[PDB]
Amino acid sequence: QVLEGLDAVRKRPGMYIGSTDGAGLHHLVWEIVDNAVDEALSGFGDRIDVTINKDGSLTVQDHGRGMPTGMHAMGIPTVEVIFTILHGLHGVGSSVVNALSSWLEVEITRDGAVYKQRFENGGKPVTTLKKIGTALKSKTGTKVTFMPDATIFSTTDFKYNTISERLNESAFLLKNVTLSLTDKRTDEAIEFHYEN
Numbered sequence: 200q201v202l203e204g205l206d207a208v209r210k211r212p213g214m215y216i217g218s219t220d221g222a223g224l225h226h227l228v229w230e231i232v233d234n235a236v237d238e239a240l241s242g243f244g245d246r247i248d249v250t251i252n253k254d255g256s257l258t259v260q261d262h263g264r265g266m267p268t269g270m271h272a273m274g275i276p277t278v279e280v281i282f283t284i285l286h287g288l289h290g291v292g293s294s295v296v297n298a299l300s301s302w303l304e305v306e307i308t309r310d311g312a313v314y315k316q317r318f319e320n321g322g323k324p325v326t327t328l329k330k331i332g333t334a335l336k337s338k339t340g341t342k343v344t345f346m347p348d349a350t351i352f353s354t355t356d357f358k359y360n361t362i363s364e365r366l367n368e369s370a371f372l373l374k375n376v377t378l379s380l381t382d383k384r385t386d387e388a389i390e391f392h393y394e395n
């Protein structure tokens with residue numbers, strides 16, 4: 200298996216996300232949401248919150264275990280490896296989203312600590328995974344916020360109705376997990392939850 204850096208994604212986006220139109224833009228949302236959904240399917244976290252921010256960025260927050268906060272090789276955080284190397288690694292498409300974003304932030308909460316790493320300009324880390332604060336030991340989760348790269352996509356406008364429909368469908372497949380969407384541009388909001 201040949202590993203590659205994020206440049207490879209930026210030079211052939213359609214190979215990873217299908218296109219660079221609205222469909223491809225929204226593929227970025229699906230990749231991050233799917234990470235949260237996979238974690239919930241494994242039994243960790245009962246709500247997944249999606250927010251379309253006023254600045255055009257998008258946030259997905261889960262309440263799962265939190266990504267591992269330890270080191271890979273050479274003092275490089277596991278989180279950094281997941282977000283900057285691909286074949287995406289270990290079952291997530293986070294690296295593809297990072298590659299196609301002008302910036303991305305990942306915040307992890309677990310073990311009484313809050314950690315954050317920031318990437319810019321197609322996934323170049325501008326910080327390490329830094330402890331930024333504390334939380335109760337019972338608090339766990341992962342939050343990812345990204346700004347899609349306007350130099351790549353023909354549209355960077357997230358569509359509320361498109362996201363709403365997909366999250367509704369995901370809530371129906373998952374069961375017993377609340378999927379929420381909030382649009383800070385318009386104040387629109389909706390939640391989905393299907394019991395079984």
Ligand SMILES: CCNC(=O)c1cc2c(-n3ccc(C(F)(F)F)n3)c(-c3cncc(C(=O)O)c3)cnc2[nH]1
Pocket residue numbers: 231232234235238259260261263264265266267277278281288289290291293341342343
């Ligand atoms: C908001 C979007 N959520 C994520 O992208 C997300 C990834 C993720 C995750 N990860 C997905 C891949 C990875 C890993 F490769 F970094 F381990 N973590 C794990 C996780 C997975 N496997 C083990 C543990 C653990 O605590 O032992 C944790 C837990 N929550 C997650 N949310």
